[PDB]
Paper text:
Among them, levansucrases (sucrose: 2,6-β-d-fructan fructosyltransferase, EC 2.4.1.10) catalyze both sucrose hydrolysis, with the release of glucose and fructose, and levan synthesis.
The binding mode of the pyrrolidine iminosugar in TPIS reflected that previously described for the fructose moiety in the structure of levansucrase mutants of B. subtilis and Brenneria sp. in complex with sucrose. , This confirms that the pyrrolidine iminosugar moiety in TPIS mimics well the fructose moiety in sucrose. The endocyclic nitrogen of the same iminosugar unit forms a hydrogen bond with a water molecule that in turn is bound to His113, and a salt bridge with Asp62, considering the nitrogen protonated. The alkyl chain attached to the above-mentioned iminosugar endocyclic nitrogen forms Van der Waals contacts with Trp147, and the ethereal oxygen makes hydrogen bonds with Arg145 and Thr168. The electron density was absent for the remaining part of the tetravalent inhibitor, suggesting a certain degree of disorder relative to the other three iminosugar-ending tails of TPIS, which are likely to occupy multiple conformations.
Author numbering:
A (entry chain A), B (entry chain A): 20 to 431
Write the structure that this text describes.
């Protein structure tokens, strides 16, 4: 394939509205419950099939989380006044990230299952995000995830789930295979940019051609600082908006790759599908919903990774089209699908939109009193969106961390 | 035809953003020039062909305006301090409205041509808006306009244009034929609502079937107060937005009619194309652009005719689709195409979007100093928009009242 990417332009991004009640995340209460007092969780990945369906197994719902320990009694986090520096502990989570699983009969009130992989199985100590796929009714699972530092590679590891009346166990995740890394012609490398982004596999079977593909976060290849913000990247901005400052340093994209067959053992990279040069450096955790004859491609991004001269909220953005290879259109004209409320701009992150319309996210920082705030590291209230053509609309909210099964699979 | 209308819902209208720089009219300077110190003008109607092309004749650009005299020395407008009450004179224009024409070799600096029709030719003293159509290269014109009070009827009157090196004359507009009025089953009548809207013919030849049609402003038929704001009219509003108050009293729609042949002597009304029940009472001066395989249907509306619980600016709104009979989608997700800036919310009105992308409007009220303001009754700066799929983007601004010809027609 040699398709041209869809450009999310600066003029599109000028339409972002942080004050639109149809695209704003409901406020999180400062009295939120926490799902564990021994671990933090953040990016959450429901067990699913390749067509997107979120599944239970023998009546058990299952989710994976990036996870790190809480250290409330560790001297390295106790300050000179003996106060626990929970902000520092929370910020240190990324370097200690490991994949854990949780299970529940109800889709909430999650029971901790522990590590997916034994320590030392992963080629990198950090285990960053991806997707767990239930392959069949024998309980075989492929976990697609990101190995980071040194380098960054999308990888997979095969294992299995077994259950009983007492709970769920994931086991036999012992051999990680790296699948691919940034190439330097389509996706930017560490050599081209020490802060390059390359991560977050989201595999699926295409509803039109029946092949196995994945989307992932990349950056547009090229030496940092060399990218052109030209007419296509600027788009039809209004008078006064022609100066882009240092916008060339923001080069996020959603990448695509195709498996050479349905085993997903070996992959070919394909050119970027959606590019945000001059607009935002991060289009993270891309994923699809396939509904009404359309491809809805969602991705999460941050207020602080926008280019100079633009502003937008942390939250989830989206692009829609009728063909896998595009062209796509920005959802709601600007691209924004669900943004945090400007009064609590960092309350939630890592929205995962599931085909039943429910969106899960985790709680990051919620203001309390004065300039004071509470750190979450726990699931936020799930909220439903509905999609109508190229637009979306937020609907009602559900319990903290509610991720119900769309289908139950009984093991053979 | 029995097609279902496209509904512009309350949830769509919740997306309106008065602060979007890609959809905001440039600010009008309080030092604007006035095109006449003897008449006010407002709604402006360029001479055009049925395919939308704005035309000059023998090198002369021609526009029609609704027009009323200025009365700066009339005792009825001089207050007890001898100050001229220009606000009252300006507000009294509607009851004195008459169709005048203007001409220019440059598309600006308009020369006054005087009345189109002699007094007493029109069945009603008020001559309200419509469209002047150049029928052929012999200089035959059909003027479609609105006869109001008593009642409201869409009407037409045939005449001709002749020119010389000295200027333009329109003449022989002597026999007005009323074409149709509100029926009571599709469009609301005076009996159903003393404030019913029915006006503003915009005729065109359909690019797909070659028939002559027109759009116009209507209201959805039914007794005032009886209309249902149900699930379709509310749309997928977010939590907290379910109460609609008195929204059932706002029932604007864009109507459509088809000529029984290309003479446009006799017409059949068709069901509403776009309805705004529970959203806005006024979808005025509807008109099309046909571009990129799509129908772009523009209409002007007011801040003050929105239903309870919604807010939006005076300006032009739009809907886009691939088929004359729909369904259509709201432009820019909310419907807003060009809104007045919230600092000058009443600076311009009656946007007419022409197929070269230029938009003409008139100046209404521009703030000066304190709670003080200046009344216009003259043309505003023309501004260009570009259309890209279901979105629009404001571009550069031009001189006051610049309405250049897209094509010149030499008379035979």
């Amino acid at each position: 394939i040699n398709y041209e990417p869809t450009v999310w332009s600066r003029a599109d991004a000028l339409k972002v509205n942080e004050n639109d009640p149809t695209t704003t995340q409901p406020l999180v209460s400062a009295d939120f419950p926490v799902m564990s007092d021994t671990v933090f969780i953040w990016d959450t990945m429901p067990l699913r099939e390749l067509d997107g369906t979120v599944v239970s197994v023998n009546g058990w719902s299952v989710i994976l989380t990036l996870t790190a320990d809480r250290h409330p009694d560790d001297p390295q986090y106790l300050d000179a006044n003996g106060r626990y520096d929970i902000k520092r502990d929370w910020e240190d989570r990324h370097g200690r990230a490991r994949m854990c699983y949780w299970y529940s009969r109800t889709g909430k009130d999650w029971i901790f299952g522990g590590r997916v992989m034994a320590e030392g199985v992963s080629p990198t100590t950090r285990e960053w995000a991806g997707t767990p796929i239930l392959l069949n009714d024998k309980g075989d699972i492929d976990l697609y995830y990101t190995c980071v530092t040194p380098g960054a590679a999308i990888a997979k590891v095969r294992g299995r789930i077994v259950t009983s009346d007492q709970g769920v166990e994931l086991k036999d995740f012992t051999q990680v295979k790296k699948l691919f890394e940034a190439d330097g012609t389509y996706y930017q490398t560490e050599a081209q940019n020490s802060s390059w982004n390359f991560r977050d596999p989201s595999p699926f079977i295409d509803p039109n051609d029946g092949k196995l593909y994945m989307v992932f976060e990349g950056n547009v290849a090229g030496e940092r600082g060399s990218h052109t913000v030209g007419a296509a990247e600027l788009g039809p901005v209004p008078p006064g908006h022609e100066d882009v400052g240092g916008a060339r340093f923001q080069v996020g994209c959603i990448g695509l790759a195709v498996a050479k067959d349905l085993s997903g053992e070996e992959w070919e990279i394909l050119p970027p599908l959606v590019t945000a040069v001059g607009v935002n450096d991060q289009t993270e955790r891309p994923h699809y919903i396939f509904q009404d004859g359309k491809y809805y491609l969602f991705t999460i991004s941050h207020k602080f990774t926008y280019a100079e001269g633009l502003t937008g909220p942390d939250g989830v953005y989206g692009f829609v089209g009728e063909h896998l290879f595009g062209p796509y259109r920005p959802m709601n004209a600007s691209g924004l699908v669900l943004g945090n409320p400007p009064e609590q701009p960092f309350q939630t992150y890592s929205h995962c939109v599931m085909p039943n319309g429910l969106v899960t996210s985790f709680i990051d920082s919620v203001p309390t009193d004065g300039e004071d705030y509470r750190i979450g590291g726990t699931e936020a209230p799930t909220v439903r969106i509905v999609l109508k053509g190229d637009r979306s609309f937020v609907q009602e909210e559900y319990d903290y961390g509610y991720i119900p099964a769309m289908k139950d699979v009984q093991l053979s």
